[model samples]
Target: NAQAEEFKKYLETNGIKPKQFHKKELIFNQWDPQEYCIFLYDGITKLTSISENGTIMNLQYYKGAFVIMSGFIDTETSVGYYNLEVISEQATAYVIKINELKELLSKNLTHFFYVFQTLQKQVSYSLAKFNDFSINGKFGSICGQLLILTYVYGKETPDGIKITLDNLTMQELGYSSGIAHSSAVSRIISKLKQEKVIVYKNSCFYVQNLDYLKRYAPKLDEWFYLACPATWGKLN
Candidate 1:
């Protein structure tokens, strides 16, 4: 709460304001620069990159987080770009212009320190996911991605946490997990459904037993350990 309060104060002082978007809105497109860096105030979104051959990779998921657009990081360098898609029915974000944000960071040491820490944590988390993909086989990597999604975006329910897969298809999952075939992704999903580890209906997945799912990707525990202690508590 204190952190949130502090962030609010920072936003107010910097004249940053929140904007809302409807479901399925394109927050930003790949290779397209924006004037503002987005800080997600509420709801969930997915970051995706499309290969030259038209393969879609689910790069990352965000919920209540800050995402510094590539344009903000470096205006001169140009190469890869990622798309931000709104996954929730409605999403809100604090939109701060890149120039003003940079100026604020230069002037405020305390705010800059926290912002740097946040960026470092995000980098580490992404690296962890990348490492999981590199080291594990298709099934293991896919399972690890699902576990990360569950921890980051799952909504609590009496039975278990609900993980929606509306935006992610088998092809996308396969691409993200380094699996060459979408059929393999479908097979794994089917197996999980049959095993009752997950229940699938209407494009949504409900994780009934997280522990059972965790067995597929134990390395993911480190992610929860560092980023989501409350979610880790649920596991135990």
Candidate 2:
């Protein structure tokens, strides 16, 4: 849409060329973010971080999104690291130096406004996902994630809306749904398939009935309110 076009123009004007990464490629390490803040122009990227206790956490998923690296705002003495990997078959990103982007934003209020709105949307969606994982049961949380993914990446087809599950492992699903084991995610998928809420074929999930799926899922608006409390009245 307009945002995509605007970003495209920004990249071109900034003399930044889009770079492609093969599936499972490392886009950038959290520790090595000194050069650029990756702007995801297309495809999915997975962000993961390790806790002090050695537990790996799925921090976020980026698809056609922007990620501000810690290098942009962190001091040279700061510590900690994370991973950003290509989750889709291939991904494209525009690599812009953090200082360069900051300078551009300083000069262009219009561009800054669009960037702010984009960041707000992504932050709100991420916060909602976190809340869903924290409060919802395993089944309900999975449904909530599926609903959010549908809204984020689903494509309309003649039969229904299709979401690509090609890059998502059962383990990732479990992690996103706040379940500890991939087996649990498998069971939930089986149950959903049996219920005819979704069809999993060719590494894609075709949602047969969107309304029925939403009915079975937890109320997403409740979670959205956590990010935008002021919009509580408009939700109804």
Candidate 3:
């Protein structure tokens, strides 16, 4: 819990700032001896081993509940810089001195082992769920979007959420969401505007009533009926 705070202070003392810590950011470079060691303080991170040809193999996952890199304690071997990606909503980490980390490695080894075992179990469970939901493309996509929206806007917004095209473009959807064209995303905005669900202004789309969106997200058909009563009952 206080890891991030302690890291901030450590960085501050070293003349670094918040920007130095890449929270929820991806590192595409190889690990270098010069680079700092990252200590994940919350959420989970995926560390992929990339070959010279750019093929990526997911080697390990690091979560805040465990200190993963501690396994390399007392080692002088330099593991090349890894491509670190944040895979969870609340994922965050801190950078720490490699030498200073060794002190906790022995004492924390047992806890780390249990954490690793628990994570393996979770990975197995997730694989099963992934296969079960793989066939429902539309449902899967919509559920993913809903989860994203929940994170972005939560359940309440007193002043409406400012959803910019830039923000949408930054998401994984921009690269591969079956929306072949960027204009298609804009079309979605147009459709939502026509339906009076949101208003596009000042280069951002603001939900007219955020509460309505939150309430209708789970029971989306209710909003559809309210928006178009003519074909609501007939279609669904």
Best by lDDT: 1
The candidates, ranked best first by TM-score, are 1, 2, 3
lDDT of each: 0.73, 0.68, 0.45
Across residues 1-236, which tens digit of lDDT does each residue of candidate 1 receive? 34545775788676676788988887778867565667777777888887898777777777775655545445633234888888789888886766667777777688677678778868778777776666656767877888887876678877677875566677767766867687888998888878888776567767887777567666676878876678777656
| lDDT preference between candidates 1 and 3, better one | 1
Cα error, residue 212 of model 2, in Å, equals: 4.2
The numbered model that scores best in TM-score is 1
Instruction: Look at candidate 1 and give me any clashing residue pairs.
Output: none
- The weakest ten consecutive residues by lDDT in model 3 span 170-179
- Residue-level lDDT tens digits of model 2 in 1-236: 56667767877886888888888888767656455667787888777775676666676677775644545433433224777878788888887666666777777688788777766876667666666666647787788777766665677777667875576678887766666778889998999879888887777777776665455454565543454344333322
Which 10 consecutive residues of model 2 have the lowest summed lDDT?
227-236
TM-score of every candidate relative to the true structure: 0.83, 0.77, 0.40
In candidate 1, how many Å is residue 140 off? 0.8
All models, RMSD in angstroms:
2.8, 4.8, 11.1
TM-score of 3: 0.40
